[PDB]
Amino acid sequence: TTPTQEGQTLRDSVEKALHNYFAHLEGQPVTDVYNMVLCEVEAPLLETVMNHVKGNQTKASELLGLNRGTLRKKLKQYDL
Amino acid sequence: HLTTPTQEGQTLRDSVEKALHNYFAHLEGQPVTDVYNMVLCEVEAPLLETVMNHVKGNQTKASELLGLNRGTLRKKLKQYDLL
Questions:
Q1: Is A19 in CB contact (< 8 Å) with chain B?
Q2: Do B21 and A64 touch (CB under 8 A)?
Q3: Which residue spans does the record list as DNA-binding (chain A)?
Q4: How many Cβ contacts (< 8 angstroms) between chains A and B?
Q5: Which domains does chain B possess?
């Protein structure tokens, strides 16, 4: 009923977070942007889902629509 | 820096934390699937377009920044409709 903002949607959070990163660079060699960015999304993504199902990795997999192996593969890339 | 009423900039990783805490809180219990594609497709989408403007359509230079080959970039570039 009072004044209230919208809610930075995940798509808009990236877009404006990236955009502000392509201004503090202003021309300098930067490679592996996809792997760097995916990493900073894939870690929090992976470990936030592991809370909600309390680490039950069988239920973690059904959420992301992944496979247990594929899940535990990326899972093992961060923290067992 | 900003010594003027200004908040702390959501570092991208933090932004992923909050949007999923918030996401899952409103779905605690409902069978949700394909969150990996769904999040990925919501990160790759801006990521491609945002870079695809830093160098103005030059896909060759897009792959030199992103770090993909002109064939993973391309088939991805059009997954999120940027051919």
A1: yes
A2: no
A3: 57-76
A4: 110
A5: 1-83 (1.10.10.60)
